[PDB]
Ligand binder design. Structure first.
Ligand SMILES: N#Cc1cc(NCc2cccc(CN3C[C@H](O)[C@@H](O)[C@H](O)[C@H]3CO)c2)cc(C2=COCCO2)c1
Length: 765
């Protein structure tokens, strides 16, 4: 039955628009297989199309906005793109039609509407690019009746082991196709849909823009050779129309030119399924998917007061749809330094210089290949897997579709090496690498990241203890299935726990340090004078100078998060010996958080160093770090320390802004200093943790119940309204918010953990 649910989930999630790095494209969850991508651009001149053409996601003054209006990876959805440079409002509807043995069928409609500022007679080039990787697989464009191109549909017939037999149809579409009266029309036709079928080595098929442009350039070269010149030139849109040459190949370029508005369909028909997919099927399955998206949203994200209004419902649907719509499938080699240089042990003073020297050895090499199915922080800026971000992404996704979230967790833990390391940043294949400067590609097996995926597992365990619709919850509805998932994952969780304790260990014993436990002490590896990238809080101020005796209170709290999860999951599997050990470790972290990290002087938790004179010094920078044992759910509801932290959270002169909690106190010496990334701005992921812990205390007998209720009510309101006001004004989710102005700043399209706002609105934790 577990095995049977797994096969149904594989068949359900196989196809998607799983290329979030590009405006629109499809691929299945198979490394070497069939991939599609859309390109478009206005052409007004002989040289402009190279600058107007769109393919990979960006955000600049030329693009108003874009994103999913609705999306469920089992059904598909609808994306809107508002392009100022090309004067076009585009819609891309994608739908999946189950059937057959090869992951079903799918269809897409591309609709382009000129905006009010566009010339009514604008010429727009549209390209559908198709590639297929694999040794024993075939793809062939059926040639047209006509001499120079297609009057009707383009049919590609292909086959592979993975997909069996299939046809992919690009329909004629609706819209004016311009006609050239030039002499050239005798040899190239007056204007029509054309296909070029080509072959390149499999590993470069992803480079769709340069491949297209090499063909356009060959066509212009042919014009120069055959005496078409500036004495009497063809129109630009005809200069940039490829000569029809359909055939067999691993690359197929389908090109159309439209004058004014256009639409056309893509129909992928799996032969092993029922009848072939039609344009009438597409229209029906699109209407049905919207209905089902609507019904599910209302059950799962039931927005509570004061956000019950239709304005907040539209905001919620947009934040949620962009988060789940970033889900990608990535496949390829990773760049990893596997030297394990001893300098990476960071055991001396000045360890950052020694570790620089080791990095300048450049022993990193490509390894894999690996696959990953995951959500991403940002399509235009960060279109790849980040380890602690994915913990935040999956909290709303798990509400939507717990079986989807378990699949993404399973995908992440299948990356873990023998030692228990998962790289914090997954850059899988040349396409993923193309977006990342060579300097920032290399992963280091001594770099951790917060284990925020354990938070999702906690939500699953609580849900466990208490057909697309059926599959989305099969792993909770069928307890046997839930447990077997956990039985299989449990060892890898344990391995990661053991990896943190071997690789991220702090030094109690070699210094004048007294504490309950000799064992429980943690220090993040990887830290430089100005930075600690592995914590997630890049430039949050830490002990200066960095020092092998440092202890980090956030890291100890994350280790607490893991033990608590291992206790729950261990108990469930009856792993008795393990639970006795975890229980003793938890007890020890509870005591040692107080003995090593609590400051009575300052009334909060603090990181620690070793003095010029070799004694334990607390270093207190009031901010997110200061709250960490509260944020990770480690403090008893009656704790006096909790009460002092509630005082710090509520204090306007420290953390509390009208727009949410500040990353750093206005009182701290390092407020608004240097790059100011984590040194003042409001971050929705840490606000989300504070909101959930306040609510926990608010719905429980104890002394701070009513303090918590007031702070919960106001913080939820402030965070939601800040993200909402910015969305209404700009159309974007932002990376962080300015605590003086409330303005979104840094990166747009951050969906991204900013989409936690949908869970904050829906409440009832
Ligand atoms: N100004 C400032 C600023 C800082 C950076 N820093 C490097 C960096 C590298 C990868 C991802 C991230 C995003 N966050 C950083 C979060 O702190 C971390 O916790 C989280 O996991 C990751 C993933 O969401 C930042 C980059 C950029 C810039 C890069 O390329 C496009 C244009 O903007 C601007």
């Amino acid at each position: 039955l577990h095995s049977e649910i797994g096969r149904l989930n594989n068949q359900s999630l196989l196809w998607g628009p799983y290329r979030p790095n590009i405006y629109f494209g499809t691929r299945p969850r198979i490394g070497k297989s069939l991939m599609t991508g859309l390109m478009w651009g206005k052409i007004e001149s002989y040289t402009d199309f190279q600058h107007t053409v769109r393919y990979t996601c960006e955000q600049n003054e030329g693009m108003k906005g874009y994103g999913w209006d609705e999306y469920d990876p089992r059904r598909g959805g609808i994306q809107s793109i508002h392009d100022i440079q090309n004067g076009l409002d585009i819609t891309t509807s994608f739908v999946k039609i189950p059937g057959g043995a090869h992951g079903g069928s799918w269809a897409a409609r591309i609709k382009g509407t000129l905006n009010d500022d566009a010339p009514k007679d604008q010429k727009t080039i549209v390209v559908f690019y198709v590639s297929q990787e694999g040794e024993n697989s075939e793809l062939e464009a059926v040639p047209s009746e006509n001499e120079f191109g297609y009057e009707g549909d383009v049919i590609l017939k292909g086959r592979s082991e993975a997909l069996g037999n299939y046809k992919l149809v690009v329909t004629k579409g609706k819209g004016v196709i311009p006609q050239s009266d030039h002499d050239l029309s005798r040899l190239r036709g007056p204007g029509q849909t054309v296909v070029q079928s080509l072959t390149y080595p499999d590993e470069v098929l992803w480079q769709a823009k340069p491949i297209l442009f090499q063909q356009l350039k060959a066509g212009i070269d042919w014009l120069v050779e055959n005496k078409y010149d500036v004495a009497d030139p063809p129109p630009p849109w005809q200069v940039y129309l490829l000569a029809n040459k359909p055939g067999s190949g691993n690359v197929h370029i389908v090109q159309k030119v439209f004058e004014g508005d256009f639409e056309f369909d893509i129909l992928f028909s799996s032969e092993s399924a029922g009848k072939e997919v039609t344009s009438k099927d597409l229209e029906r399955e699109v209407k049905q998917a919207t209905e089902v998206f609507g019904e599910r949203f209302a059950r799962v994200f039931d927005l509570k007061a004061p956000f019950q209004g239709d304005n907040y419902k539209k905001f919620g649907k947009s934040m949620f749809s962009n988060l789940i719509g970033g889900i990608g499938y990535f496949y390829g080699h990773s760049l990893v330094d596997r030297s394990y240089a001893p300098e990476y042990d960071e055991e001396n003073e000045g360890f950052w210089e020694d570790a620089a020297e080791a990095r300048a050895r450049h022993q990193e090499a490509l390894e894999g290949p690996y696959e990953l199915f995951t959500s991403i922080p940002s399509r235009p800026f960060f279109p790849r897997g980040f380890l602690w971000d994915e913990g935040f992404h999956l909290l709303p996704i798990a509400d939507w579709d717990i079986d989807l979230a378990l699949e993404i967790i399973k995908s992440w833990y299948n990356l873990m090496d023998e030692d228990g390391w998962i790289a914090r940043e997954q850059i899988l294949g040349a396409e993923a690498r193309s977006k990342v400067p060579k300097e920032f590609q290399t992963q280091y097996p001594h770099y951790a990241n917060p284990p925020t995926l354990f938070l999702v597992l906690d939500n699953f365990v609580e849900r466990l203890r208490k057909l697309d619709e059926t599959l989305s919850t099969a792993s909770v509805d069928n307890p046997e299935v839930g447990l077997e998932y956990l039985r299989r994952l449990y060892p890898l969780l344990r391995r990661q726990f053991d990896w943190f304790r071997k690789t991220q260990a702090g030094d109690i014993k070699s210094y004048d340090r007294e504490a309950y436990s000799t064992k429980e002490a943690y220090r993040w590896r990887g830290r430089t004078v100005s930075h600690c990238l592995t914590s997630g809080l890049d430039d949050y101020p830490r002990p200066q100078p960095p020092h092998p005796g440092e202890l980090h209170v956030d890291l100890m709290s994350w280790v607490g998060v893991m033990v608590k999860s291992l206790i729950s999951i261990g108990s469930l599997l009856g792993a008795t010996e393990d639970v006795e050990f975890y229980t003793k470790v938890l007890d020890a972290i509870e005591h040692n958080l107080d003995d090593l990290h609590w400051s009575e002087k300052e009334g909060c938790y603090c990181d620690a160093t070793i003095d010029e004179f070799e004694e334990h010094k607390l270093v207190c920078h009031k901010g997110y770090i200061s709250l960490f044992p509260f944020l990770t759910g480690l403090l008893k509801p009656d704790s006096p320390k909790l009460g002092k932290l509630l005082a710090l959270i509520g204090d306007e002169s420290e953390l509390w802004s009208p727009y949410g909690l500040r990353s750093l106190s206005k009182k701290d010496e390092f407020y608004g200093t240097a790059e100011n990334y984590w040194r003042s701005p409001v971050w929705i992921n840490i606000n989300y943790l504070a909101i959930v812990q306040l609510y926990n205390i608010a719905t429980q007998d104890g002394p701070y119940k009513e303090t918590a209720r007031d702070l919960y009510t106001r913080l939820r309101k402030n965070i939601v309204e800040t993200v909402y006001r910015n969305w209404e004004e700009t159309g974007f989710a932002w990376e962080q918010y300015n605590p003086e102005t409330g303005k979104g700043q840094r990166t747009q399209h951050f969906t991204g953990w900013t989409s936690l706002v949908v869970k904050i609105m829906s409440g009832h934790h």
